Amino acid sequence: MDIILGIRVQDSVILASSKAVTRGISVLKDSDDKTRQLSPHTLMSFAGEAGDTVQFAEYIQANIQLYSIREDYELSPQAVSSFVRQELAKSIRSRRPYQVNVLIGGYDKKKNKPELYQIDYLGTKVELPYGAHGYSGFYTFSLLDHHYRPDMTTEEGLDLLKLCVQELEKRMPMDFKGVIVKIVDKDGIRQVDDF
């Protein structure tokens, strides 16, 4: 799929992901949710080749859910991100690699800190205050470099995110049909229904 954005503010992580799904020359769906909840305080958005994205995300989801039940304990965002990276690094040298790029947004309940991890299909992990995959960063990183502070509120994070989407909508040739925005904080994961 096309565009996935992420931003880590003071007390939360915000993920924005496009709604479009295209086969051939036709947009089949304009309300697609490119994300899976890995645990109550960990959300993963994804983008890449058709089919591989959902299969990979659901496979990761199942493994983390299995861990949660076995230990009766939620893995830290850092631990989950490392697990995901290894699976992608394992995948890239397989017969047929999974062509999937992800952003992992989580709230660490132990440290009381939001955390955003960017991982590409090769298994390249980086912790960031804000991130993106594909061409999305080319348009948005200049705005984020300018406006971003680490002490921003969730509302200010959403306003800066709106500005990023507006820039994408102006200068990108592709119509990605807007974004679904989700917020990850101490209380869990919720969706912003009006954006």
Binding site: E71, Y73, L75, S76, Q78, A79, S82, F83, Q86, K110
Partner: protein
């Protein structure tokens, strides 16, 4: 054919017991006593070497206490060779976990893994079980200080204080008497040595017949330190507690 010579190591008795597991436990009961005591600010591991010789090189010797990683250690009771097979597997499992999640392995997860391996030898494969009982002493940021034990059946349980090997019945009674919840490491060290001194089959408890170790948060600020005691250090703590 070959069936004639098969002992059938993985079967139930009419009473519903596993023969080989029960006989392995009988073996372990003759092994040198090992004791573990958990305190609020650390864990103690004490163990008795079996009838040593004067010509045994003690400072380079290790038969009872083994290091699994920086946070977790084990006391052994039974066949040392069998224990080393399992110890090396556990060391690998801890490193696999660290590589995968980039975090040190939680104590229980490591214990469950080793206990599952022991279980497998009682249910399938037709091989004899490992004649080993472990005391696991470890620390993690979830449950803090933890003591566990596993035996050849593959069953594991958590403890505040526990003994394995010889004279566990007598040793457990003495620990149950003097142990308290608000106890500290220095007190636990004294309890461990006093218990061994009374339960031992030897005439007197000396430095050359002991292996000793502690896991303390007594390390500079929020971190954990493993201390495998040297022969001279065991000699000093024996004088300090007033046994020799």
């Amino acid at each position: 054919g070959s069936r004639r010579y098969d002992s059938r190591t993985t079967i139930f008795s009419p009473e519903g017991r596993l023969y080989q597991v029960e006989y392995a436990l009988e073996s372990i009961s003759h092994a040198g006593t090992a004791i573990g005591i958990m305190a609020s600010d650390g864990i103690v591991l004490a163990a008795e070497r079996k009838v040593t010789s004067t010509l045994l090189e003690q400072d380079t010797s290790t038969e009872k206490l083994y290091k699994l990683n920086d946070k977790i250690a084990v006391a052994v009771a039974g066949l040392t060779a069998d224990a080393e097979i399992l110890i090396n597997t556990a060391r690998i499992h801890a490193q696999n976990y660290l590589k995968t999640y980039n975090e040190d392995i939680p104590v229980e997860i490591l214990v469950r893994r080793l206990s599952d391996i022991k279980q497998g030898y009682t249910q399938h494969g037709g091989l004899r079980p490992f004649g080993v009982s472990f005391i696991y002493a470890g620390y993690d940021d979830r449950y803090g200080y933890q003591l566990y034990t596993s035996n050849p059946s593959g069953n594991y349980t958590g403890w505040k204080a526990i003994s394995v090997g010889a004279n566990t019945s007598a040793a457990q009674t003495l620990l149950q008497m003097d142990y308290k919840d608000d106890m500290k490491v220095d007190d636990a060290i004294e309890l461990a040595l006093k218990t061994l001194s009374k339960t031992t089959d030897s005439s007197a408890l000396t430095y050359d017949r002991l292996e000793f170790a502690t896991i303390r948060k007594g390390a500079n600020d929020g971190e954990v330190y493993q201390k495998i005691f040297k022969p001279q250090e065991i000699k000093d703590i024996l004088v300090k507690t007033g046994i020799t």
